[PDB]
Design a protein around this ligand. Sequence first.
Ligand code: ATP
Ligand code: ATP
Ligand code: ATP
Ligand code: CL
Lengths: 95, 104, 98
Amino acid sequence: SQQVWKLVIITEEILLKKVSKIIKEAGASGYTVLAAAGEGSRNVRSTGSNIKFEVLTASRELADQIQDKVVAKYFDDYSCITYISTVEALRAHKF
Amino acid sequence: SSQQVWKLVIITEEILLKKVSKIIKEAGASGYTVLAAAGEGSRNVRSTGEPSVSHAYSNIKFEVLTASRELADQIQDKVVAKYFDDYSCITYISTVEALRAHKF
Amino acid sequence: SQQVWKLVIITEEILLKKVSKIIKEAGASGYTVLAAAGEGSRNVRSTSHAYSNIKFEVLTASRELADQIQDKVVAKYFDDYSCITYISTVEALRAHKF
Ligand SMILES: Nc1ncnc2c1ncn2[C@@H]1O[C@H](COP(=O)(O)OP(=O)(O)OP(=O)(O)O)[C@@H](O)[C@H]1O
Ligand SMILES: Nc1ncnc2c1ncn2[C@@H]1O[C@H](COP(=O)(O)OP(=O)(O)OP(=O)(O)O)[C@@H](O)[C@H]1O
Ligand SMILES: Nc1ncnc2c1ncn2[C@@H]1O[C@H](COP(=O)(O)OP(=O)(O)OP(=O)(O)O)[C@@H](O)[C@H]1O
Ligand SMILES: [Cl-]
């Protein structure tokens, strides 16, 4: 196993392509996205359901870079939460 | 910058969607996230019968972030007290690092 | 009230029954599966934003057991199918045993 960072982004379904774009252009080796629903307290939803991304990265800087861009671009105008933890991933994959 | 917060996960029957949701909101959590799920478990208490269909999406997974470990286990306590014996559910708690942005 | 381990397996949806059996045939109390989509870098997919993946979560009382399931899944399918796995620790009530 190899210790890596795990960035989670939960945001509006309409931002699927844009956030996928950010992740890939930052140089992450991939991402996973799950369909979700939710409620939050900011009440900023651009449309008046959600997606949850998980991005594993070996470097904390890359996780921070992706988090920073997503938050800077979409936090004010779109339902969006992010958080980071660490996990131990398989060594047979690049992160 | 950042904030160490608690993440409560509840995995239970889909039929408890609104009841568990209201537990979360009434206890004062800033929000929650819920995903449809399938699964198998060993307690064998699914309210609709066993042996159940293993790959039907009959479950839901909640994630609740809170800054207070007291609020997390207040939610978990209640959920377990009301539904654990009667419904196929399961819970666990971790910590994650969030930005001091959201009031959790 | 007790530390347990969480094994996550993200793989092709077509492996749902095969991987579920490995988790079961191994000895894990249960497992949770969620529909998923994604992209990776190996480009081994046997068949982007289509929900063509699945995400397994398996809670185990022991790190050993989590490693065993991970090992069996990777051994059988990693080369031939899109697949990643990771392990973290979480806290669970004693009222459930894993
Ligand atoms: N404390 C929390 N725990 C878990 N998930 C949360 C929490 N707060 C918010 N979320 C998730 O983040 C999403 C967006 O919440 P946010 O507060 O940023 O925007 P919002 O406009 O209030 O969202 P919504 O329109 O869904 O109420 C929610 O739909 C929910 O899925
Ligand atoms: N060890 C585990 N790891 C991950 N998820 C689990 C585990 N055990 C149970 N689950 C999840 O919790 C749900 C409830 O399982 P539980 O054992 O409480 O009830 P059950 O009635 O046996 O469930 P089922 O009818 O699905 O077999 C399961 O369907 C599964 O999604
Ligand atoms: N760095 C990462 N962070 C989060 N999830 C990832 C990461 N890399 C891969 N994944 C997930 O694992 C799955 C398998 O990717 P893998 O690289 O093993 O095969 P792949 O054939 O390149 O995948 P795909 O056909 O989706 O491009 C991906 O679809 C994605 O869901
Ligand atoms: Cl998830």
